[PDB]
Design a protein around this ligand. Sequence first.
Ligand code: GSH
Ligand code: GSH
Lengths: 214, 214
Amino acid sequence: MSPILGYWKIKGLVQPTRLLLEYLEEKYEEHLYERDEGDKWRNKKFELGCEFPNLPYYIDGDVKLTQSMAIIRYIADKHNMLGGCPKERAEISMLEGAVLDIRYGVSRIAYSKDFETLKVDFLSKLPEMLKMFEDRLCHKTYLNGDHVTHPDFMLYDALDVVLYMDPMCLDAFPKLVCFKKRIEAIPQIDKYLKSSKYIAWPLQGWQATFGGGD
Amino acid sequence: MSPILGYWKIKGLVQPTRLLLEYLEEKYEEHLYERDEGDKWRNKKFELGCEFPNLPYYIDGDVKLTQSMAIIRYIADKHNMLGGCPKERAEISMLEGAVLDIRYGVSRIAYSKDFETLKVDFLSKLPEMLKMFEDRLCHKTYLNGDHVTHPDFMLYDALDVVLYMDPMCLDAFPKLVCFKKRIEAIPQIDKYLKSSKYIAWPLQGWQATFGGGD
Ligand SMILES: N[C@@H](CCC(=O)N[C@@H](CS)C(=O)NCC(=O)O)C(=O)O
Ligand SMILES: N[C@@H](CCC(=O)N[C@@H](CS)C(=O)NCC(=O)O)C(=O)O
């Protein structure tokens, strides 16, 4: 009747998936566990039929999927966006990993006691990572060319987050600044960000030192 | 003439890829950067034609690929092992992510100053992660059934590593113990592990607190 995307009521690992779903105008319902509902999750964790119980999870009546990256790729796969041949498929997975180096680079330091200092190390190397995408966008509208692929929403999510860590990290990366605005300009995305469904905060778990809180 | 797999001369991110290549009897050469060859890497980093320069990298004359997960999937993709339909494809990516939770769980704490204490937290939750694979192997020979898929070598690599962190972590997981021995029993793998090509140590960068050193 309608696929279900379950996760904490935060951006975290699943925000890019939500954006991809909105871009595709796919119908879905959400199981959003609030910060005071850890017990609620534990009572459902093992009764969903998931072989590798975790959050996020995506139940499609066709699959009981868990890992965030498998979920985003599945939805894109349903719409035939994963590639066309091994080379394009690898190209897209390479973009995936590259964006993850940034997004995980943030999550990895979030919630540690040393976040304030680890943040300076991450930000010192952020430019080198960002530069690769800036170059990539030199002759391509989106990461994989003229057409949107899931890594575009992944990059979008990563940019949204690092801007919170350093509001100036994109100064000097005009292509990236344009890209972020282009994604927001996509009718479906524009509508979603301005909707009741948009979860603007937190970036990480509420308990995180960075991107946490209400 | 022959694809190239470049990485540090350590197991790290690329060991499962090496195993997949050996299983498939694929021909390849390796660019193995020794611990005192950081300068050598920096002099090659930007002259390989890679759009997202990094280690590992895989040059096939067909592609200039970098991200470790994109590389392993590409090689499997060349041999038509990624799936068959979106559901099987997602099944395999879910297994990927699940193994990564263990492998990255280790790399994430390796090299931190607090590794000794972080190690106890990781190991306390390791059983719950391992149990999912133990259950999975209850009615399946390999992770995806009767046939080997790349996540099997990923799981193998993860098991090899956590056993160094805790030689007893698999006691109580007989299916996992059998699985590890089954992978080692694959003729191609048996031959590889006993060969000159096998890199037994280090597990992480030589400078890591865990799995480092010569
Ligand atoms: N590698 C997994 C990790 C998932 C994960 O760590 N989920 C966290 C939230 S970010 C959840 O709290 N896990 C719930 C649990 O372990 O029961 C993925 O990418 O989905
Ligand atoms: N997400 C990337 C990360 C790669 C990576 O961090 N490689 C390290 C070794 S584990 C290398 O030293 N990077 C070299 C560089 O950044 O120039 C992957 O999975 O390949």
